[PDB]
Amino acid sequence: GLLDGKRILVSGIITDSSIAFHIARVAQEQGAQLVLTGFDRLRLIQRITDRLPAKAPLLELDVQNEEHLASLAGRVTEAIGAGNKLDGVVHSIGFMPQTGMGINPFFDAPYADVSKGIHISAYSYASMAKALLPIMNPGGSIVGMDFDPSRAMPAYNWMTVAKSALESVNRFVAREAGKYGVRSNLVAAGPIRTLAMSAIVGGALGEEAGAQIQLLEEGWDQRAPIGWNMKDATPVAKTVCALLSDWLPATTGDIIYADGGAHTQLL
Amino acid sequence: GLLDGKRILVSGIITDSSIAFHIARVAQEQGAQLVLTGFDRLRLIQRITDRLPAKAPLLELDVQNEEHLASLAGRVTEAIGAGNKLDGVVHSIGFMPQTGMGINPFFDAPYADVSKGIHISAYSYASMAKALLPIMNPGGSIVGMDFDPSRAMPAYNWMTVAKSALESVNRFVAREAGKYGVRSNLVAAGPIRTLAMSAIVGGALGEEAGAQIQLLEEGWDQRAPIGWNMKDATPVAKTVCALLSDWLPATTGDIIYADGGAHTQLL
Amino acid sequence: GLLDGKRILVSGIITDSSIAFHIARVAQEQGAQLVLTGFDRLRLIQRITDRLPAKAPLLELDVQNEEHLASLAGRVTEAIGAGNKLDGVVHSIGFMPQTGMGINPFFDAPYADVSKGIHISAYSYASMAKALLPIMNPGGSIVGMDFDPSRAMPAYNWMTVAKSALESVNRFVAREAGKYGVRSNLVAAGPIRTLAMSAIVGGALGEEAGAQIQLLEEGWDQRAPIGWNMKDATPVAKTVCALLSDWLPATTGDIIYADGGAHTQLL
Amino acid sequence: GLLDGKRILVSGIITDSSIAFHIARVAQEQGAQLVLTGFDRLRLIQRITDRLPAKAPLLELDVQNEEHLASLAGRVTEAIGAGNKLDGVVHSIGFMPQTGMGINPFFDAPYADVSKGIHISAYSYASMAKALLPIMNPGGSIVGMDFDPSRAMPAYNWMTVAKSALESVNRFVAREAGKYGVRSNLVAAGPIRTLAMSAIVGGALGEEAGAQIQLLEEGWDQRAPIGWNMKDATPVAKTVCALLSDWLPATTGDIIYADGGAHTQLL
Numbered sequence A, B, C, D: 001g002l003l004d005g006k007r008i009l010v011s012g013i014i015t016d017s018s019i020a021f022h023i024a025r026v027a028q029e030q031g032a033q034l035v036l037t038g039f040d041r042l043r044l045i046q047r048i049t050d051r052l053p054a055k056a057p058l059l060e061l062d063v064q065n066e067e068h069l070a071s072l073a074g075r076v077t078e079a080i081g082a083g084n085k086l087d088g089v090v091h092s093i094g095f096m097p098q099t100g101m102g103i104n105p106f107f108d109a110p111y112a113d114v115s116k117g118i119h120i121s122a123y124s125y126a127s128m129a130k131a132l133l134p135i136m137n138p139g140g141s142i143v144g145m146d147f148d149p150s151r152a153m154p155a156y157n158w159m160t161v162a163k164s165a166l167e168s169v170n171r172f173v174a175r176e177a178g179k180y181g182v183r184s185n186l187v188a189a190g191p192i193r194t195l196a197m198s199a200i201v202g203g204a205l206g207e208e209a210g211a212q213i214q215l216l217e218e219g220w221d222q223r224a225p226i227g228w229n230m231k232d233a234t235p236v237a238k239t240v241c242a243l244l245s246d247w248l249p250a251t252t253g254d255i256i257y258a259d260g261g262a263h264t265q266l267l
């Protein structure tokens, strides 16, 4: 197993189409022992994760709650046993209020909404590293989920700005994590048909926002030299597991693109 | 004159070493008619700007104050006369609380502080564009000040994250501004010895933060193929005026580097 | 005039739709005194440049001819007068044999053909700098023409590789030019309907190569926040003149994008 | 084993400090069956590779020899058996004549020398893909070795330009390889003390070239958040094996940085 004997915390599961659900499944297939964290709807998340190949403890974590963050390391240690530390951490958490996405004009998002989205989607990558690095082993790995924000695009709007901030945060987290012998990297995935993303394509955020996202998805598979299947998160999950493994030991502060190669092609 | 007959709003003057003070001076030397905006210490700013080559109206603008922003376009129109519009806007505004910079550990900045810095330094670029685009002429130009955040560095810490967010915001502002025939760009300057920056090199934010910034300054002049004079903001001011002029008419959503070429060289 | 009193060498005119023809016209409109260089068909080029606003001396320069390059500085000095030096140099030269472009498979271009294209399109930027820097004034400016090669695309094929090499060459030319007080930069233009480019869209290099280039052109105007007019080279010419002027004095080794902002937008 | 059952061709071994020697060793440790290719000194290379964990067939390949390239696929098939195909290809080949590196001025490299270096170091990545893709399995992987050329630096000179060309070639090879279900990527390594590199630091290419490279090496370990050991190629070799494996299945046309994170940090 690629991750045999490793203890890995995975955040971000909310449905069976969550990218983090497939990260967790593949990590368990490869021998990892998991601790899961979930936000708000813990009964739902427990029912969802009962379908993973192995039972895993589930801890509550709202990344805006400083009490959850202050207690997290102790709750993880209780779950994996005293004297044991984590080898890996997966941040698969993102949110932007509806005013910051969709057909709602870019200029009309109030800063309170933008700040909440940047808190959950970017600052919390530093928050989780701060909480968990003291209980991580040398040779460990922190991985977060990214969507390439180097160019503007329709509808993503303020979430694009949040991802730009996240990429910057990751480079600073690498500086801190390096003192522990730990790597920090992001995986920039192509579009994946989660429940939330299917709802937006179906017009949850306005019709032409849905139309624009559908056009973006189609161009992605066209550009990608090996194609891109938005209905299959397994290639993204495998890439996260590659970064959690010992096989990219000299990569940190960096971004790995699991996007079919689409970002390397103009058309 | 490069800017003859143009009406340009310039924010960000607080002392005679402010980058915006030199932008304003060079723009007036080149024939522009200015409206100035200032934050908080308006009596001080009026005294400072009395030393500009020409008298200019000074308007109060705290970019965190929605009432200041809601009234700004009307106050500008009163200052330049009904039926007149702006040809240019300069955003030269930045702030990050001390916890987000210096020797203070990156992980110890509370989100309230980071969010305030991102509000002032990044979101407000969109806020000012929203306020002023309705009173801008086709062919107009919005310019903001940047510090290349593509790599992490010591001490800049959360201000680096704010600049990453600003670069992303600029690409979305270009989308909106294009509907008015207006360009939006950033100037990424090398280090400039403002009053605040001299204080930090002198240890206002901790000793080794000051030591690290001094090392960064020295490496900049070494890397720059044409050298870099941190005591001379005129090359930065001229670059801003180039973007305000009609001579870069097909550049938008972009970043122009006024840094001596340092970012193009590894050592 | 933006370039009043400046002496500027302009290469690359072959027809009245050459980008260099419009660079030369705008530079003369702005007060520059020009020396022109032309390749092979000098009688044709003289007839073309008789239509410029002012008469300019025309010198022969095949950038693959070491004798032309060894004599160039002396021939320029004869044209502008002893004791006078150049303030600006424009490289607007590119060529790739047909096997390296179009529907002809990427793998089927022989290296002899690729090497000729890289010689003319990339190495010659260093060759011209070597020849002309000894007769350039401090504060001078070298500008070359680029087409953004950071992503692969259909049909451009080996010319894309040549532009990647050119961008690298430019960063090294900046190191050398800096010792003379001279800047070196590229302008990355959007697509322009030169005679050669119209012929390729019309199928000179194969039908689906023409089809692919037409699709690339259409997406460019769609992406550009201020639009893109492939029939109008004046915005590109003005950007070159901006870099030749004194108004971007701290930019070197760099690339300025005169592309409507298209490269800053995904769709 | 990470590469259990995979058939992989590895080029570029010349001494026991070659990066390709360590790629080959790690690949064999992980269960791969290798075919090796060597240039010119085949008796030496056979003696060197006798020290690998397993015996591997050695084929002659001068990438400038079209007869070697035309026969390569048939010689590989003879070595692995009819009906068998390759799963992986490693390009670890580079050369630039001495005039294109070191204290020898950048402008003094003749194009004949530069063209030879670009032939061996960049064009040959396309040459090898053309030769070997017809005998590669779907799901296969082509990997080449890179040194980040996005910024100029002392001494690397024309080899930097060759690496810029290689990165561009890789994006086009990905387009071709995708039709076979094959990925193409580069690994950008930090500096490694090969025999050639130790000789240059010792002044083989001039004293201040050696001095400049030693300064570059020292800054690399300082910048890298996890450090950088130029005497240990194993982290680079493991990264190549990661790309040869099935664990980065959605990455192509891309560059993975095995450099300690140094390129993500300014200082």
Ligand SMILES: NC(=O)c1ccc[n+]([C@@H]2O[C@H](COP(=O)([O-])OP(=O)(O)OC[C@H]3O[C@@H](n4cnc5c(N)ncnc54)[C@H](O)[C@@H]3O)[C@@H](O)[C@H]2O)c1
Pocket: A011, A012, A013, A014, A015, A017, A018, A019, A020, A038, A039, A061, A062, A063, A064, A092, A093, A094, A095, A120, A145, A146, A147, A188, A189, A190, A191, A192, A193, A194, A196, A197
């Ligand atoms: N789906 C795509 O197309 C795509 C592409 C690239 C990257 N990503 C990124 O992948 C990450 C996971 O998103 P997803 O697509 O799997 O959608 P998802 O809705 O399944 O996951 C989002 C997760 O964020 C969590 N979350 C929200 N607020 C939180 C809080 N205050 N505290 C803790 N957790 C909170 C949700 O509970 C949920 O588990 C996100 O960073 C997303 O931006 C998604």
Ligand SMILES: NC(=O)c1ccc[n+]([C@@H]2O[C@H](COP(=O)([O-])OP(=O)(O)OC[C@H]3O[C@@H](n4cnc5c(N)ncnc54)[C@H](O)[C@@H]3O)[C@@H](O)[C@H]2O)c1
Pocket: B011, B012, B013, B014, B015, B017, B018, B019, B020, B038, B039, B061, B062, B063, B064, B092, B093, B094, B095, B120, B145, B146, B147, B188, B189, B190, B191, B192, B193, B194, B196, B197
């Ligand atoms: N000095 C450098 O080295 C350097 C280098 C590159 C970029 N920059 C950028 O240039 C910009 C101008 O900074 P400076 O170096 O001239 O320093 P400065 O201190 O002279 O200017 C900062 C300005 O921000 C304004 N400001 C702060 N909070 C505000 C608010 N709530 N509303 C409105 N205005 C507010 C200040 O009043 C002040 O005028 C900043 O964006 C800075 O990041 C500076």
Ligand SMILES: NC(=O)c1ccc[n+]([C@@H]2O[C@H](COP(=O)([O-])OP(=O)(O)OC[C@H]3O[C@@H](n4cnc5c(N)ncnc54)[C@H](O)[C@@H]3O)[C@@H](O)[C@H]2O)c1
Pocket: C011, C012, C013, C014, C015, C017, C018, C019, C020, C038, C039, C061, C062, C063, C064, C092, C093, C094, C095, C120, C145, C146, C147, C188, C189, C190, C191, C192, C193, C194, C196, C197
């Ligand atoms: N047309 C576009 O869409 C576009 C876009 C971006 C950049 N560019 C670049 O602009 C430059 C000028 O090209 P153009 O579009 O105006 O086409 P063009 O055909 O009008 O100019 C090409 C020039 O290269 C010159 N040339 C070729 N071989 C030469 C040699 N051995 N010695 C000296 N000169 C030689 C030609 O004589 C000709 O004057 C080129 O670098 C081109 O790549 C063009």
Ligand SMILES: NC(=O)c1ccc[n+]([C@@H]2O[C@H](COP(=O)([O-])OP(=O)(O)OC[C@H]3O[C@@H](n4cnc5c(N)ncnc54)[C@H](O)[C@@H]3O)[C@@H](O)[C@H]2O)c1
Pocket: D011, D012, D013, D014, D015, D017, D018, D019, D020, D038, D039, D061, D062, D063, D064, D092, D093, D094, D095, D120, D145, D146, D147, D188, D189, D190, D191, D192, D193, D194, D196, D197
């Ligand atoms: N050593 C470093 O610091 C470093 C860092 C990053 C990347 N790289 C790259 O790694 C690759 C391998 O280089 P290395 O450092 O292991 O040095 P090396 O000298 O051990 O390997 C170079 C290889 O190129 C081969 N070669 C040269 N000409 C050839 C030809 N005509 N045909 C076939 N093969 C030929 C040599 O025989 C030799 O095996 C190169 O692309 C190099 O640029 C090296």
Ligand SMILES: O=C(O)CCc1cccc(Cl)c1
Pocket: A094, A147, A153, A154, A155, A156, A159, A190, A191, A192, A197, A213, A216, A217
């Ligand atoms: O980050 C997310 O959750 C969604 C990422 C995304 C995919 C496809 C289109 C867009 Cl606009 C955005």
Ligand SMILES: O=C(O)CCc1cccc(Cl)c1
Pocket: B094, B147, B153, B154, B155, B156, B159, B190, B191, B192, B197, B213, B216, B217
């Ligand atoms: O944006 C600012 O006001 C300061 C920019 C800066 C210059 C030199 C060093 C650092 Cl760390 C930061």
Ligand SMILES: O=C(O)CCc1cccc(Cl)c1
Pocket: C094, C147, C153, C154, C155, C156, C159, C190, C191, C192, C197, C213, C216, C217
């Ligand atoms: O460099 C040149 O002369 C042509 C640049 C170009 C424009 C539009 C499409 C393509 Cl593929 C290439």
Ligand SMILES: O=C(O)CCc1cccc(Cl)c1
Pocket: D094, D147, D153, D154, D155, D156, D159, D190, D191, D192, D197, D213, D216, D217
């Ligand atoms: O590609 C190669 O073989 C050498 C790469 C390299 C390492 C360290 C310093 C320099 Cl200048 C170059």
